[PDB]
Symmetry: D2
Subunit: 544 residues, 4 copies
Amino acid sequence: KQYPLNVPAPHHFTYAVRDLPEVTVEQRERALQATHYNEFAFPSGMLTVDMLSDSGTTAMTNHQWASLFLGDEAYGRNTGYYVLLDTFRDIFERGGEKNWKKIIDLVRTDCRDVEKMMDEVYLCEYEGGLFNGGAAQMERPNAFIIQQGRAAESVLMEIVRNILAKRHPGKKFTIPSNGHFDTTEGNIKQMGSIPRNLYNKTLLWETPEGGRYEKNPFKGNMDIEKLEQLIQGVGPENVPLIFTCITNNPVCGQAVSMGNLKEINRVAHKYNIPLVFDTARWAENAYFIKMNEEGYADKSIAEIATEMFSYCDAFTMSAKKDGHANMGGMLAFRDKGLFWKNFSDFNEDGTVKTDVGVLLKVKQISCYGNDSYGGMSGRDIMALAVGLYESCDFNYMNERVAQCNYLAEGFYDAGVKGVVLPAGGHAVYINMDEFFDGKRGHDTFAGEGFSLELIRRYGIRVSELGDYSMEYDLKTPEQQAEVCNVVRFAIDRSRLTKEHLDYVIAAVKALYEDRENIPNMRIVWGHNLPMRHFHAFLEPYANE
Amino acid sequence: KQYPLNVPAPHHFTYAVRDLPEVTVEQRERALQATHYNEFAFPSGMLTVDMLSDSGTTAMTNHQWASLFLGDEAYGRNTGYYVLLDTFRDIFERGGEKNWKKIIDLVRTDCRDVEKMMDEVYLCEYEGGLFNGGAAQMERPNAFIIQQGRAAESVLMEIVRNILAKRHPGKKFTIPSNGHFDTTEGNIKQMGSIPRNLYNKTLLWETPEGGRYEKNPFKGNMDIEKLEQLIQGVGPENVPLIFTCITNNPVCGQAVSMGNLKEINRVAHKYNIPLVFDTARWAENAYFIKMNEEGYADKSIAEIATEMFSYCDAFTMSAKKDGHANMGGMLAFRDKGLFWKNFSDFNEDGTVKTDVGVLLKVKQISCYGNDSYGGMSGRDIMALAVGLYESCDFNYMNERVAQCNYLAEGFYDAGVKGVVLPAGGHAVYINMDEFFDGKRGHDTFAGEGFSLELIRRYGIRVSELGDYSMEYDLKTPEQQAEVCNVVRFAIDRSRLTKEHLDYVIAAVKALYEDRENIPNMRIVWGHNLPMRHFHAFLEPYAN
Amino acid sequence: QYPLNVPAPHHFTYAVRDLPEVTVEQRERALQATHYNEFAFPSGMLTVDMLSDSGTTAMTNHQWASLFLGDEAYGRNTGYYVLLDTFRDIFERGGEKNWKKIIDLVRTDCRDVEKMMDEVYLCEYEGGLFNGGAAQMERPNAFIIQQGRAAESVLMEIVRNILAKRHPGKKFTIPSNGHFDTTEGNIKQMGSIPRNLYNKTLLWETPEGGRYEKNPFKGNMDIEKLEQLIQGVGPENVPLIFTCITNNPVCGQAVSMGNLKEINRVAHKYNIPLVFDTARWAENAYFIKMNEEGYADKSIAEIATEMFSYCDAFTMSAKKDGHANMGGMLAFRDKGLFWKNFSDFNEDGTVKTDVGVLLKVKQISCYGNDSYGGMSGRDIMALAVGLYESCDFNYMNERVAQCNYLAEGFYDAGVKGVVLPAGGHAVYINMDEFFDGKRGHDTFAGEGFSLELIRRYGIRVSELGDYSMEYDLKTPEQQAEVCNVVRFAIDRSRLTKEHLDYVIAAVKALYEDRENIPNMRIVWGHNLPMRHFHAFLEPYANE
Amino acid sequence: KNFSDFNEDGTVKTDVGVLLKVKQISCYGNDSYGGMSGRDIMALAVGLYES
Ligand SMILES: Cc1ncc(COP(=O)(O)O)c(/C=N/[C@@H](C[C@@]2(Cl)C(=O)Nc3ccccc32)C(=O)O)c1O
Ligand SMILES: Cc1ncc(COP(=O)(O)O)c(/C=N/[C@@H](C[C@@]2(Cl)C(=O)Nc3ccccc32)C(=O)O)c1O
Ligand SMILES: Cc1ncc(COP(=O)(O)O)c(/C=N/[C@@H](C[C@@]2(Cl)C(=O)Nc3ccccc32)C(=O)O)c1O
């Protein structure tokens, strides 16, 4: 029996609330100058809608809050370490809710059977996949809990550099990807390697009839020709790792398809090159696949998640995104997989001599913390495990992405030009070139003035992720052609509602209609710093 | 500098979230019949939008959740006892934020000066108002913490009934109000007393041009003429108390102006009749006064709240409403005021013989709990104190009532017949005589069939507060003329967003366009029970 | 007054957690299944876990209340300002009388935005350890980070890059009163040479009765040895001088203020920046206040500001004396000695490369934004509350009393090798005096002691002797500073006398059976950096 | 049996349970929570197992 309506039934409600401050325009002018016009230095408690980053900003579910009280703060082998690892196993290896072990439920039900705990939690042995356990994790470490994504990439990048520097001193390598985001690209350039972003920058800027594609075209896909012309061009022996980002955050958070991941796997393994996933927004990407890629409409997000991860030899993850949590990170690689083969040292008789996993662990434990908590508190570790399961839920993710489509189609319906469609899984992007109608030069940095104008006028903070923040003027010509000149409106998970989005639409429309009066922005300090958009001082000036 | 927009800035955001269930129509229909078609017995774990009641259903603020951990669970004199009493003093006696002592901040800042805590919290003396403190509260007790409003009313009504029985055995008294609710009225008929609702039932149904009153007309006001005509018709000696509800919950949660309060106070004290306020929705009312009544536009909720309460001799409050909380109640009377003079007994020389405040305290402690917690946990007492300060915040209350305005205008702009206007401060009401175009009877109980259809089809729960749940059939002809045949959509404080509201608007519009399909309901068990909507069994037949 | 021999209690249990019911055989199985690595043993199976006091604290109710005030914004969450200014209060403002406690504005829910800009967001501070506002942007000298090893690792990395693009090849020496295995491991992995300069003869001294009259401050750095090594190796080859308070390597032993002053003078004598590791500052301050002359009237907070005046830079693991489960901090004096030696300047004289900026680029690219530095927003708030709790004399006086009670319980029970007096966080036993000379350095019998505590009694402790400090992997000079002790670290606020009585009895029994404690053989990872977190062991009987 | 009233044929006329429920609901709270907060209910349920 059906009683349909032209509006959907909500699937969550506000469990607890938090008030927003009352701030004048004039007060936000004082704070802007007082902080050198750096978005990252503007006070949070002076804002009305904060869309700076979806990283760590989530509103937890009531079950996550409950779980804080189940966290274990012991220094060695706190119980959440086992629970976290087997939650990764559940979502990314087991394949389907019907296959989950959900040992988190032994902690949630206050199990007091020590024997059962031993046999199903503490002493379980796993080998052969992304997450060893028991003595196998001790003998062949391959999973590394850490505070966040950049810490996971940096522990990884350092090890790779050390090893490469020993085997090929003074040689620099090219590490391509579909989209290296500022953290990853900056940590790469800092290691000495050359990053490259291979995608179809042409499809990116097409917008569909009526404003809404009928199917999502997966604009985050890696161009497979470009990837193989790059490998044959510079030499495969010069390409030590291949990266893929899911979803593609640099390329306007656009989805990446399962067939695309299968191609990257083919090309990469063709040349014996380990393939590393950046999987911060794994669950948004799984959702786009289910909703758009033929054959995947009746598989679950948990199913698609395991399948996507079958194609990688390693991955880095900031769980502060689709962990639906406020902290967490993870680095893992296939047990005795392609990444472990190339980067370990072997004896003549075939036995391992230097395990890359041991080198990684040594760095983890000297720079971040014991492997059992990775620089997280015990309670954050339990809330993260719960949060990762929440991201598997269709109705939650359906509403999470419905919010992005609403903001983008709002920007469109209101006559804002240069709105990238469809929306990414976490954010809506605006092409600043089409926005100012090509009346500003790549060194105007007007996209930065647009962002500071949102703050000054409306208490809305966004993130310029184009020429200025991607360091257009400090890159090579090929890298310059790979820059998307876009401003980003990121949507915190579970924290905002239609009323926040309607106000942002109204305010963007107003700023559009007054775009001539948006200033340009001049760097007055830090123009050359690594990842300068976190450090540099700015100064506005009018256009001429 | 101003940068105007045609959309208001948001004033809060979601701190934490809870998921709603995935439920079929077949599943809800199965549960409706397993539970005899009583909406209070329907499992809330199966609802999509629950609008049964705003009482206790609030999403707390994060500062309230923090206060929980500051709660003191001791049996005698928990610190929360003092904090809560003095929070009542700040809001209802001290006249404005600038006059608040906010001793809750000594708890919040972990003050460890025993001397300072002694002088500013534990040992303070207060007398002469609604909340005695220290030795005064022991000698002349006049404030009683208790877990909710119906408990606050019951203690008062029992002690009033006992005093009236011993002094006037056999006399049946009349007690008027602008509107007594099902619990209040039911608790008064259970004494054997005659409750009466004196309001302008004609003003009530007036729909305004366009559906937007330029100013709130205060349809909750008591009819002063009708009040005098009742005091003189029954004789002052037969009116031992005068009640006044703010907002007027029974009369479509309609606003009550401050001039009205001044008048009721005058008429009452002309006859030496103590005036008791039901103040569950004080802060929504203070907002309506500020936004609509001449000369108060520049006054804060908190100022207006002190001024309202100055016109009363006692009050009962269910703090589960405008206390932004999930539990809490309060009963108080002015120290040595008119309520204490007419209900205490004195010696020949005029000193007190039997103190009515002691008679309520003995009842409080023997049936509810010690006067330092009154049936509440210690953490709930702290969270209540924080919550009552939050209800004074203009922007919070301005956005709370906006939701109700939004939902009623939604109903109107969709062409549903019977939307009372303006909306309540907590709920929107629909007149079911106007919904069905006069095509259903007072015994068809079509209002219950509507509320239950909302559940079956849409997983929306509402409260029929009309003929059935007000026992129109079990009332005197005089009282049947004051019965409002309306269904109520109550909005939980801070829990719902626009998304929830648009869904309800859509669902009601669809059911309005399917009026004839809404079955009738026939009570099959109960009917002659006090407050029978909370327990009666029901069954549907076609019209 | 009415004295009693029994002290009065100064805290109680706010909430409880149950412990597991486990058998010897279950524990023996888990030990074999986890290679006999004490860090791989499941905490879920333990009765009393004394592996580490770091991050294992039971928070106060006010800290738990704190968690709900944490701000999870990416850019400049409010907790960033509150935490910085808590460091200013405790470590720069010289006593409670001069604190600002801006955390109280958060805890009382300040909604006056101008007040918040002028007292929190836009404050300017320069000239000390914690710049604020544009100063902290222009000359960054404070860095929030998840824990101490991340702090020292960001220092030591930046120093290494400088000392190499300046003195290529050269290998420098970094003295300290006692570098911990974390600091030493990181120094050694940087290429430099750690060295710990203290009086090992004093350390083993016993007081007649097992109770000293005044703490002899055996963690003090040997003033003579320091100038001998600086003159020996040459000033230009000592780039930094560390100092640990309390001295964790040297049995968590207290360090006097006089000694900090002396180390200050010798260090500027040759223009060497002085760098304090202050993980356990509060207990060191408490040892000063009770033992040095003319400090008995000074409170913890005054002594903490004073101690900190003598450093040019500090690293801190707030997971210890911050009464918290996560948190670290790196800081240095604004335009101070450390900033002068390690920045690069123009001929004009302006800074050319600010060492502060280099540290910030590292922090931001490898840990997290400087506004949260890899911490969640609620852990920032709770850390700020916890640092204030560590200044309270009654807390810190019951905390250290649990160590005295444990060491003196061992002594009273005939156990031999108990270092004295107890440290501020733990009790240390010398394994040589324990086994009465009858075990060799290569026997690792201390690790057999620790593992046997697990097997029979569910007690986990840590070996910090010739196995974990890597005796056989060090120069002989380094080998003589190695302390052969097993540590009993006492979690802050988590345990009670009942737990200690049981560890006391369990150690007495296992001392009386020390003839039967196995020796430990490293089967794998004998050479790994910080091998006690990695290595595999196997038990073997003693011959 | 003792405190309810019964009809001639044998069936209940005045059920004592119903009388107790009317008093519960008019003086303390709905039977669903009886004057307790929702969270106090759940923590009580956990508490009783613990005992
Ligand atoms: C694909 C991908 N890979 C790795 C990481 C690092 O993970 P982690 O260490 O932070 O947890 C991220 C994190 N992205 C963030 C947060 C942050 Cl500073 C940032 O990192 N870049 C940036 C740009 C503009 C505003 C704010 C930010 C975001 O999307 O806004 C990522 O998107
Ligand atoms: C003005 C006023 N004064 C005192 C009290 C007593 O307070 P308390 O004991 O419950 O805390 C209340 C109670 N209000 C509730 C709950 C309840 Cl059963 C009811 O009483 N009437 C009603 C109508 C429809 C659905 C459910 C209900 C509510 O408004 O929905 C009140 O409205
Ligand atoms: C003076 C000083 N400087 C830096 C740090 C690092 O701080 P952080 O990064 O861990 O937060 C510490 C902390 N020491 C800890 C943690 C640790 Cl691994 C250890 O170092 N030795 C050991 C032995 C058994 C269990 C755990 C441990 C402790 O002894 O309890 C310190 O005392």
